[PDB]
Design a protein around this ligand. Structure first.
Ligand SMILES: CC(=O)SCCNC(=O)CCNC(=O)[C@H](O)C(C)(C)COP(=O)(O)OP(=O)(O)OC[C@H]1O[C@@H](n2cnc3c(N)ncnc32)[C@H](O)[C@@H]1OP(=O)(O)O
Ligand SMILES: [Cl-]
Lengths: 15, 319
């Protein structure tokens, strides 16, 4: 979950 | 070991217009990402033959959620508990989903009442070259004043988790969020209905003292509709929308993907190709700032992107 105005605030996948 | 399952293939997604879509495997599609719920390994533990059904009525996205399985571990004989797959999913879908296909089908009966939210921006058709079916699509700008939009957006946003690697859910109370929606029109029982195709959220970012630079945040064309020109239509319509506002400087994106960059290049080259500053004779003289100037003024294209447009067009006019 992202800060103000952000919709890509989640975790990267690390296979 | 038969009790560890890949959640990318275990999660079965459908968009449903007709009762028969429930038994048509062609209608089912699968997440590209499940790591934000099921970890880096994208696995769920404790179940053999795991099926996580997330079925959506095509327009409204009214939801059926069911977890099925052949067997599961018993803490008495296996000495371990199965994963709380149901709880994990309920973290990212709103409450009120139905839990069986009977109830889901009853909701399908009244799906004709579903209407698109917001203001109509653009309509387009994919016409058959061969005397076959034509398809018709519309793009709307919607907001939380639209009755039912808030709840619909909650149903829709779940799809970002499956298809955008680092998706997070936005703060819808923030008034700088703009929403752009794509619908396909279709007929059923002599009526006209609307199927959700995809969408975009754009943050209307403040540029001191009195401008904005709209930022494309989350963009998704649902799996069954991808590679058919909808993404391009959507980004073009968005640029055309913001072009009417003098206070808009230009448009950017939040951490764009490689595929988004490619899409954006496609759309922006199309927009600029026949502008006077990008004539062949201008291109052959090398990049000139007035190309960025014209692209910004005409289509709210950011200077960095106008330069890529130049490069791509220079390559196109040569051999
Ligand atoms: C970055 C962000 O703001 S969010 C991340 C973007 N979203 C995602 O990655 C989610 C999953 N993907 C999608 O939702 C979609 O596939 C999108 C939005 C990336 C593209 O939308 P689509 O409707 O599939 O693209 P559309 O059919 O309009 O493509 C138009 C042209 O752009 C280019 N293009 C689009 N997608 C791609 C791609 N994945 N790779 C290379 N080029 C592409 C191509 O030139 C394409 O023409 P073609 O189909 O003749 O090759
Ligand atoms: Cl950008």
């Amino acid at each position: 979950k992202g800060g103000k105005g952000l919709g890509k605030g989640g975790a990267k996948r690390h296979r | 070991a038969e009790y560890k399952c890949n959640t990318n293939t275990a999660i079965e997604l459908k968009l449903v217009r007709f009762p028969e879509d429930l038994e048509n495997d062609i209608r089912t599609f699968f997440p590209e990402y499940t790591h934000q719920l099921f970890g880096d390994d994208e696995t769920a533990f404790g179940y053999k033959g795991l099926k996580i059904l997330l079925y959506y009525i095509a327009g409204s996205l009214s939801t059926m959620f069911r977890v099925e399985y052949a067997s599961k571990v018993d803490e008495n004989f296996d000495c371990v508990e199965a994963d709380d797959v149901e709880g994990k999913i309920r973290q990212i879908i709103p409450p009120g989903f139905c839990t069986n296909t009977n109830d889901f089908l009853s909701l399908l009966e009244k799906e004709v009442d579903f209407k698109p939210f917001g203001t109509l921006l653009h309509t387009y058709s994919v016409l058959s070259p061969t005397g076959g079916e034509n398809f018709t699509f519309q793009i709307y700008k919607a907001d939380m004043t639209c009755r039912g939009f808030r709840e619909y957006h909650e149903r829709l946003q779940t799809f970002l988790m499956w298809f955008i690697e680092t998706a997070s859910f936005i703060d819808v109370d923030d008034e700088r969020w703009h929403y752009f929606l794509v619908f396909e029109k279709y007929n059923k029982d002599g009526a006209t209905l609307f199927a959700t195709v995809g969408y975009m959220t754009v943050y209307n970012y403040y540029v001191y003292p009195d401008k904005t630079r709209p930022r494309v945040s989350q963009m998704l064309i649902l799996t069954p509709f991808q590679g058919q020109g909808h993404g391009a239509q959507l980004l073009e319509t968005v640029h055309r929308y913001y072009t009417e506002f003098p206070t808009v400087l230009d448009i950017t994106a939040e951490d764009p993907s490689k595929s988004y960059v490619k899409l954006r290049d496609f759309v922006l080259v199309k927009l600029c190709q026949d502008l006077p500053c990008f004539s062949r004779e201008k291109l052959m003289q090398g990049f000139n700032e007035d190309m960025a100037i014209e692209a910004q003024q005409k289509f709210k294209i950011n200077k960095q992107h106008a330069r890529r447009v130049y490069e791509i067009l220079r390559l196109l006019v040569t051999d």
